[PDB]
Amino acid sequence: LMLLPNILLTGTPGVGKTTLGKELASKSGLKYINVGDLAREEQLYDGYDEEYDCPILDEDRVVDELDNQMREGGVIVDYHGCDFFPERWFHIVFVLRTDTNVLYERLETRGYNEKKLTDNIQCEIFQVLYEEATASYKEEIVHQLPSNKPEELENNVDQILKWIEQWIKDHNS
Ligand SMILES: [Li+]
Ligand SMILES: [Li+]
Ligand SMILES: [Li+]
């Protein structure tokens, strides 16, 4: 068996994390994990709301749920948050970025209401996730990836697959 790396795909909802992670998993063999889906599957919530009519994700339980698998390596994690993940989990972190105009159209198409649209659009224009990533991990392993069109998705997949290949070689001497 090969020692495999762990990758974090983060960024504002709508930037294309899920589409990228799923394609990466299919073309690399690594396991893709959507944190939101995982919390829903294992019911890792604590608290509700009237605000957005959605249960509140239990960060500590999410970490406990994934730790053993992360320790073993070979996981692509997808989430619009990253400050609560143990720093040791990831070998590289990609913050997907989408032009505000493009992101708005995507989220609107997803059926986001005015409130959710504004909250997420400001999250992106304020570069919240990029800042969160740089504050949570060493800047040398944090990279912003443009994600506005199929062409950039393709460039991202290609660059990450090549990164994975080099990493596996360097860490399985
Ligand atoms: Li937390
Ligand atoms: Li650094
Ligand atoms: Li950049």
Curated annotation (Swiss-Prot):
The keyword Amino-acid biosynthesis does not apply. InterPro entries: Adenyl_kinase_AK6 (IPR020618), P-loop_NTPase (IPR027417). Residues 34-57 are annotated as: NMP. Expressed in heart, brain, placenta, lung, liver, skeletal muscle, kidney, pancreas, chorionic villi and the central nervous system. Keywords: ATP-binding, Cytoplasm, Kinase, Nucleotide-binding, Nucleus, Ribosome biogenesis, rRNA processing, Transferase. It comes from the Eukaryota. Residues 109-119 are annotated as: LID. Residues 34-57 are annotated as: NMPbind. Broad-specificity nucleoside monophosphate (NMP) kinase that catalyzes the reversible transfer of the terminal phosphate group between nucleoside triphosphates and monophosphates. Also has ATPase activity. Involved in the late cytoplasmic maturation steps of the 40S ribosomal particles, specifically 18S rRNA maturation. While NMP activity is not required for ribosome maturation, ATPase activity is. Associates transiently with small ribosomal subunit protein uS11. ATP hydrolysis breaks the interaction with uS11. Belongs to the adenylate kinase family. AK6 subfamily. This is Adenylate kinase isoenzyme 6. It comes from Homo sapiens (Human). The gene is AK6.
